[PDB]
């Protein structure tokens, strides 16, 4: 830190998520002029410094640049996604900070037709495209400034989606679409809405990139740093790369599963000289990065008695035990994603996790 003027005024920003709350005793929720921020009660200094943060229509710039970024992203993928064309609606100037209704930011026109699934979360995995079909598709971009009480992006996304879709005031060309919400305050991103083949991975990758990339967001972030006068101690930053682990700890409970030592065997020689193999106690390795919580499942040799070949059984039993463990777990602690060391595990887990369809299964380009 920075080793009758600002320092007071700065103190407000730093606690501003706590000072200003969506839940208060009494208050009249007010929208800052050109922005999407909602003050509860009148705090002069908070107001001032926030208005510093967003100036020269930085909010509009952020919404715009995000939209443009997506437009280019789809402009690259035309063929793989069977898209006839991509048009950005020239955006209604005030739509960014207008919280009552939203137009459509992007229109995807299909080359032939699209089988469309039921609305689900961006973080969701299992979908059935057999729900319906369409051609036109729309994309909406929502920017909110969070706070301490509700920083949760996902419920917000699905909420605004259900509302704008079910309202008669909002204008969309097709009922099939998706709503992307990004909370600037907490730098969070989620989406809820309809899907079509190939769209989910593209949007996931595109968002994960933009959140690291978009210059507008970097202007916001930097202005926050300056207003707070925070300055980092260490050059080069820790080992961030683009690596998925930094975003991987996040809020989302996410696990690493290692089956390698589940199946182990010891060899000794008989009187014939033939080497014979007796399996030994195995263990299933499960780890949580953010809590350092190590689930170590001790697998006794009793599991290995009579059944055919031991490797595949190690695999399927491993996925089983993971499934039952997640089953006994309270919902608040359940993983949003499960990452795997040995890609051979991808098949059984995907099966044995069908009872929990929203859990993502990912293989590691990263050996650990």
């Amino acid at each position: 830190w920075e080793k009758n003027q600002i320092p007071n005024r700065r103190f407000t920003l730093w606690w501003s998520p706590t000072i200003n709350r969506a839940n208060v005793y009494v208050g009249f929720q007010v929208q800052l002029d050109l922005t999407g921020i909602f003050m509860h009660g009148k705090i002069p200094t908070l107001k001032i410094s926030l208005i510093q943060i967003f100036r020269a229509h930085l909010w509009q710039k952020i919404h715009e640049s995000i939209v443009m970024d997506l437009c280019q992203v789809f402009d690259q993928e035309l063929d793989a996604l069977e898209i006839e064309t991509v048009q950005k609606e020239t955006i209604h100037p005030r739509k960014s900070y207008k919280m009552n209704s939203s137009c459509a930011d992007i229109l995807l026109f299909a080359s032939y037709k699209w089988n469309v699934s039921r609305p689900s979360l961006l973080a969701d995995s299992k979908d059935v495209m057999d729900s319906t079909t369409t051609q036109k598709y729309w994309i909406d971009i929502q920017l909110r400034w969070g706070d301490y009480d509700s920083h949760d992006i996902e419920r917000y996304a699905r909420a605004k989606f259900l509302d704008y879709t079910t309202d008669n005031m909002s204008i969309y060309p097709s009922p099939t679409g998706v709503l992307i919400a990004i909370d600037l305050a907490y730098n969070l991103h989620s989406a809820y809405g309809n899907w079509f083949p190939g769209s989910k991975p593209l949007i996931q990758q595109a968002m994960a990139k933009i959140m690291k990339a978009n210059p507008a967001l970097y202007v916001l972030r930097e202005r926050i740093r300056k207003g707070l006068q925070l300055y980092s101690s260490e050059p080069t930053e820790p080992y961030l790369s683009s690596q998925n682990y930094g975003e991987l700890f996040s809020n989302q409970i996410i696990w690493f599963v290692d089956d390698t030592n589940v199946y182990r065997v010891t060899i000794h020689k008989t009187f014939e000289g033939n080497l014979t193999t007796k399996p030994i106690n195995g263990a299933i390795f499960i780890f949580n990065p953010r809590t350092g919580q190590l689930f170590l499942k001790i697998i006794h040799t009793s599991v290995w008695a009579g059944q055919k070949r031991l490797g595949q059984l190690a695999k399927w039993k491993t996925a089983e035990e993971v499934a039952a463990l997640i089953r006994s777990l309270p919902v608040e602690e359940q993983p949003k994603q499960i990452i795997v060391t040995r890609k051979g595990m991808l098949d059984p887990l995907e099966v044995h996790l069908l009872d929990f369809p929203n859990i993502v299964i990912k293989g590691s380009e990263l050996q650990l």
Partner: peptide, 22 residues
């Protein structure tokens, strides 16, 4: 100990490594 511990959190080399290695 972020600023307390060292002037630089990171310096690399194997100089000391390949010297003391043998």
């Amino acid at each position: 100990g972020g600023k307390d511990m060292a002037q630089s959190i990171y310096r690399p080399s194997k100089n000391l490594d390949k010297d003391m290695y043998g």
